Each structure stands twice: as structure tokens, then as C-alpha cells.
Write a protein that binds this ligand. Structure first.
Ligand code: NA
Ligand code: NA
Ligand code: NA
Ligand code: NA
Lengths: 211, 211
């Protein structure tokens, strides 16, 4: 959840907001080790419930999200239903565990390609066009993340937009991402330069991947 | 409906058969002028009902077809339901009126393209990939006719097969078609040659379009 003023500005300037619980357990092995554990349900529940209680009156918030990259655990299903029960006014989405689980109203993959399948075991990323028409699938598809804009990037962006416009159930996505996470450091003369992972003696680190 | 031996041969050699009623009213304006007329239901009903009564024991017949290019009329809906009631063992398909009407269990367009939409009014031919995922659509798609093999043709054939293999619900199609409808004439020397429309003083005619 963001700084409270963010929602007020989005209400007033006009932007649709996906408000997202502060839950990410990416580093766990496997990713849902905590989120499938009933011992972590209380802690997870507070990150979802207290977000809803705070932000539910904002018109800019149109979709609730259960967090990011925490696999798919039984705790997600429980909290999905909790939101559906207390706030029927907003769809709930969640990407973890293959982007189309029972804890999401919207197929919301990250970095699924337009035409090319990436058939990873258990959590494949289908071509977005193909994904829509998988047997039994009826939901809209909106990428929670696509077109990773790292450095000299955004090649193939037009291919996404051509597809979004042609397919009714392809309703767009959220680019990753808005602003480089570089930090300012100073040289011996006090001149500022843009720093990234590893520049603060921080180790281990993932270098320029924050930008 | 074919010569009865065809079905015996398809049974024994192993070919899947779409058995199709002898109804085509292509030349009407609009195409459903007679098929939507209850006055023509009796004539229509015999062409469907007597086909089903003859061929229903042939294993090679896997799908029934209500005919060809006769628009979509109320008579189709009645006869669709007649077959479903008497023979639940086979899906019923029919292309007329836009290939996805209430008279067909299978989206069965003719000459719909792989990627390109052809948005004709009333009866659009959507890209086959797009068609599958239109809001509320769940049926399988199998083209009753595609890859018009007229003369030096079948360009872009590989594109259909790439799509058929990638998309579960694209389950193939029927090439148009098997054999040139040319007829043998003889010259002044008694030597045989291949003839098409117009070569018999027949007029009006559509020339080589029978090949
Ligand atoms: Na769209
Ligand atoms: Na990053
Ligand atoms: Na297929
Ligand atoms: Na022809």
C-alpha cells in the first residue's frame, strides 16, 4: 500500500489504481512455502484486511491485489474470499502460482509474450492470445507486468498494443516500471552520480537490476 | 450425402467423415430467404432426417452437417435440435449465417484467416485465434473450408498448421478441395483435353472456378 496522499491524487487527477497488499515472499523455496502455511495466515491476513479497511472508499482503487510473487498458497484463497465477501465492488487479482489460479478474477501474467509460449513446468507463461482461449478459460487478461524497461529496452512494445486492440479480452497491462531505482552518491568534489546495487558496499547484490 | 459405398470405405480404411445434408440455397437474396421460411421446412427436414436415418450406423461419420451456404434461418435451428434429439452421439455443425450461430456445436468458418480479421458486416470472418476467445465463446473451431487450392495455390498453409498445433481449441480444418472439377472434351483429331465452365456453350458460367 502506498502513502495515503497517492490515492487522493489518483482520485482527483484520474488514474485507475491496483492497490496491493504488502506481501512478497519471492526468496522462499518453493515460493509458497509461507503462503501455504496456516501459521503465516494471521500475518498475511493483516496485510490484506488492513489495506482494505484503509483504502476501500477511494474511487481510484478499482482492483485489489493479494501481493506479489509469493507462489500460490491456501492462505491466498482464504484472503481472496475474504475480500470478495467484504467488498464486492472491486475485482481481486493475484499473479503468483501461474497467473490464472483460483485466487484471481483476472488472468494477470508477468512478461507473457504476445505470440510466443514459454512452457515452464507448473507455471507456464502462454502467449497471451493463446491463454485467453485455453479450454474452460473465460476471464479477461491484463498483464500485471510486461515490457521490462531496463536500460535500452521496450523493443516489441507495438506488438502488445496491436494485440490489445484486436482481442476484446486482452485489456492491456502495467509496464515494468515507472522510475529507475538509482540512488545518489557523491564524488570527491561533491558531484552527484547515479548509483545502483553494490555501490554502497552492499553484498551480495544484484547490481543494475534495480533500474 | 454420398454414394453409400463411400461410408463403407471410410469405415474400413479409417477416415473421419462430416456427413452433410443436400441443402444449399447460395443464390437466394438474402441467403436465408428459404431456410428462414417455414413453408420450406418440410423439404428441408426430409434432406436432414433421411440422411440421418440412412447413415447413423457408420462409425466413420463423426459429425452431422445441416448443409451449406443457406444463410441462417429458423429451419436450421429446428433441424439442429431434431438431430440432437434423435442422435446424441454426434455433434451437429453448420457454417451458415456466420459460422458460430445457435445451429452449430463447432465454430466452423470458411476461409477465415490465421491472424487477419475480415470484418464483413453481419457475417465477419475473425482471425481464428481471435474467434476462440470472443466474450462468451467456448466452442472448438474447425474450418469447414480453408486454403482454397485453386491453381497455383496453398500459400500460407504452414501458418494454419502452426496455429492448429499451438492452440488446443483450433482443431484443424478441411482444405477446399480434393479434385479439380474439369471435364474431358475431344478435339478434331480425337485427342482429349480438360475443360471448365463455358466450354459446353453453357452460359452464364463461372469458368475455371470449378477447378
Ligand atoms: Na482488447
Ligand atoms: Na528489478
Ligand atoms: Na489444436
Ligand atoms: Na469452386
Amino acid at each position: 500500500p502506498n502513502h495515503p496522499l497517492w490515492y487522493t491524487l489518483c482520485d482527483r487527477y484520474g488514474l485507475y489504481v491496483v492497490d496491493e497488499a504488502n506481501i512478497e515472499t519471492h526468496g522462499m523455496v518453493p515460493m509458497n512455502r509461507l503462503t501455504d502455511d496456516p501459521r503465516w495466515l494471521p500475518a498475511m491476513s493483516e496485510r490484506v484486511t488492513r489495506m482494505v479497511q484503509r483504502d476501500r472508499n477511494h474511487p481510484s482503487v478499482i482492483i485489489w491485489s493479494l501481493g506479489n510473487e509469493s507462489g500460490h498458497g491456501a492462505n491466498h484463497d482464504a484472503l481472496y474470499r475474504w475480500i470478495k465477501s467484504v467488498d464486492p465492488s472491486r475485482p481481486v487479482q493475484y499473479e503468483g502460482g501461474g497467473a490464472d489460479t483460483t485466487a484471481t478474477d483476472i488472468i494477470c501474467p508477468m512478461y507473457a509474450r504476445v505470440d510466443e509460449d514459454q512452457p515452464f513446468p507448473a507455471v507456464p507463461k502462454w502467449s497471451i492470445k493463446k491463454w485467453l482461449s485455453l479450454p474452460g478459460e473465460t476471464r479477461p487478461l491484463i498483464l500485471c507486468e510486461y515490457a521490462h524497461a531496463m536500460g535500452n529496452s521496450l523493443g516489441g512494445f507495438a506488438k502488445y498494443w496491436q494485440a490489445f486492440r484486436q482481442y476484446p479480452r486482452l485489456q492491456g497491462g502495467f509496464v515494468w516500471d515507472w522510475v529507475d531505482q538509482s540512488l545518489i552518491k557523491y564524488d570527491e568534489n561533491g558531484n552527484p552520480w547515479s548509483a545502483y546495487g553494490g555501490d554502497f558496499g552492499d553484498t551480495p547484490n544484484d547490481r543494475q537490476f534495480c533500474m
